Curated annotation (Swiss-Prot), chains A, B:
Enzyme Commission no: 2.1.1.228
Protein name per Swiss-Prot or TrEMBL: tRNA (guanine-N(1)-)-methyltransferase
Main localization (coarse): cytoplasm
Subunit structure: Homodimer.
One GO molecular-function entry: tRNA (guanine(37)-N1)-methyltransferase activity
Source lineage: Bacteria, Pseudomonadati, Pseudomonadota, Gammaproteobacteria, Pasteurellales
Gene: trmD
C-alpha cells in the first residue's frame, strides 16, 4: 500500500432512498474509490427509525397546507446514529436550496473533512429547529427546483472524492481549452494545425490561451478570484484584443 | 386517463454508465413518473457502438498529454442512434462545465421540449467539433469539478420532470419560509406561535414575509429578475427594516 492508513474518506448519508447511492458507489471513479477502500459511503434510512406500523417518515406542517415535511423523530434519530458511527469530528451537511452555493473553493473546503454526514431532504424539507440542533452547514449545488437532496449529495460526493489520496494516485479550475481527438477531419472540420504540429511548446501556449479566452467569455466570474501569472495575463490580453 | 396522450416526456441519454440512471428511473417522483408512463428515459451506451475487440471508448488528444477524451466515433454513433429513435424535433444537450448555467428559468425553457437527448461526458470531455456537428445546447448545473456528466444529467431530468403533466396532477421559485412540524417544542426550541394559532390569514402573511426575507439574505440575485407584488414589496420592506 502506497497510501497512509488514515487518509481514507468516510461519508455517512441520511436518505429515504439509500439505493440511489449505488449510482456513485458502483460506477466510475467513485466506484473504483469504494472498491479500493479509499472511499466509504454508509447510508441510514429514516424509514428504519420509525415505530409506527406503516413506517411513516413524513409529517404535516404547523399552520397547515399541502407542503409535507420530513418527520422529525425518524430523521433526527437516523442522524444521531450516523453521528455515533462517525465518532468525533464528523461535519453534518444538509443539502439544501437555502444553503451556501457550492463552487470549487467550497468543494476544496469540504474535502478537508475526513468524515462527513450528508442529510438529504424530501417533501418540502426539514424542520427549521433541526437545522439549528443537528446541522453544521447548509450547501446548495445550484438554483433550481429538485424533488430531493440525493442527487445534490451524490454530486458533492463525486466532487470531493477527487481530493482523496489514492484517487488519481488552481489553473486547472479554469474552463478547459477546446479538445480535439481522431479523426483529423470530422465532417469537413479540421483540427487546429498547431495541435498536429508536434511543437509541444506551441501546443502548451495555444491550449492555455484558449482556456483563458473561454473562461473570459463564458465564466468571467471565475477570473475575479485569481491573480493570474504573467504568462496567463499576456495570453489573455492577446485573446481579448484578437476578439475584435 | 386524465392526461392527454401526447404530453408524455421522452429523454434519450448517452452515457458510458447507463445503470446509474436507475437512481432516477426507479425511485421517488421520477420513479413514479416512469412507472405511470409519464416519463420515458432511454439510454444508449457508446461502448455498444465500438468495433474493436476491447470496446475502446476513449481516445488520446491531438497535441498529447494525459487528458483522455471520449472516442469520437462510438459517441457520435450513439448520438445518431438516439436521434433516429427520437424522430424529428429532439434537442441535443451536452451536460458540460462550459455550458450555460442552469437555473429555474433555464429548467422551464428546457421543459418545453417533449423530446430531449442528453449527452454525458467522461474523461476530459468530447471533441470540440462534435459540439458543432451534433450538440444543440450546452448546459451546466454548477461551477465545480466532477468526474462525469451523468449526475448533472440526472439533476436536469429531476428538475424538468416536475413540469410533466400528470406529475403532481414564480413566487414558488423564491426560497421557502422556515418549516415547522411536530413536536411543539424540540429540545427546548418552540414553534413560532402564529403557526400554532389557527389564524390562517396571519399564517399566510407570516410565511410569505419569511420567504421574502430569507431570499433577500441568502439569494438576493433571485429578486433581481422579478417585479414583486404590492403585498410582497410591503412585507419585504418590513422585514428589511426589522433586520436592523
Ligand atoms: C430558489 C430555488 C433554489 C430554485 C428553490 C426554491 C424553493 C425550493 C427549492 C427546492 O428545490 N426545494 C426542494 C428540495 N431541493 C433540494 O434539496 C435542492 C434543490 C436545488 C439544489 C440543491 N442542493 O442541495 C439540495 C438542493 C428537495 C426536497 C427537500 C427540500 C429541498 C428550490
Ligand atoms: C470551472 C469548472 C466548472 C470548475 C470546471 C473547469 C474544468 C473542468 C471541469 C469539470 O468538471 N470537468 C469534468 C466534466 N464535468 C462535467 O461534466 C460537469 C461539471 C460540473 C457541472 C456540470 N454540469 O453538467 C456537466 C458538468 C466531467 C467529465 C467530462 C468533462 C466534463 C469543471
Amino acid at each position: 500500500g502506497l497510501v497512509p492508513r488514515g487518509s481514507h474518506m468516510w461519508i455517512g448519508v441520511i436518505s429515504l432512498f439509500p439505493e440511489m447511492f449505488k449510482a456513485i458507489t458502483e460506477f466510475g471513479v467513485t466506484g473504483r474509490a469504494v472498491k479500493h477502500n479509499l472511499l466509504k459511503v454508509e447510508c441510514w434510512n429514516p424509514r428504519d427509525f420509525t415505530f409506527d406500523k406503516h413506517k411513516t417518515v413524513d409529517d404535516r406542517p404547523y399552520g397547515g397546507g399541502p407542503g409535507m415535511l420530513m418527520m422529525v423523530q425518524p430523521l433526527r434519530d437516523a442522524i444521531h446514529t450516523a453521528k455515533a458511527a462517525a465518532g468525533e469530528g464528523a461535519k453534518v451537511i444538509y443539502l439544501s436550496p437555502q444553503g451556501r452555493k457550492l463552487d470549487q473553493g467550497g468543494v476544496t473546503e469540504l474535502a478537508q473533512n475526513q468524515k462527513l454526514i450528508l442529510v438529504c431532504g424530501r417533501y418540502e424539507g426539514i424542520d427549521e429547529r433541526l437545522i439549528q440542533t443537528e446541522i453544521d452547514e447548509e450547501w446548495s449545488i445550484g438554483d433550481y427546483v429538485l424533488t430531493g437532496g440525493e442527487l445534490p449529495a451524490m454530486t458533492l460526493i463525486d466532487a470531493v472524492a477527487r481530493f482523496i489520496p489514492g484517487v488519481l494516485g488552481f489553473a486547472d479550475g479554469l474552463l478547459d481549452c477546446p479538445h480535439y481527438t481522431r479523426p483529423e477531419v470530422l465532417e469537413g472540420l479540421t483540427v487546429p494545425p498547431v495541435l498536429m504540429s508536434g511543437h509541444h511548446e506551441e501546443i502548451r501556449k495555444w491550449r492555455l490561451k484558449q482556456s483563458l479566452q473561454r473562461t473570459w467569455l463564458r465564466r468571467p466570474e471565475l477570473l475575479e478570484g485569481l491573480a493570474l501569472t504573467d504568462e496567463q495575463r499576456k495570453l489573455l490580453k492577446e485573446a481579448q484584443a484578437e476578439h475584435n
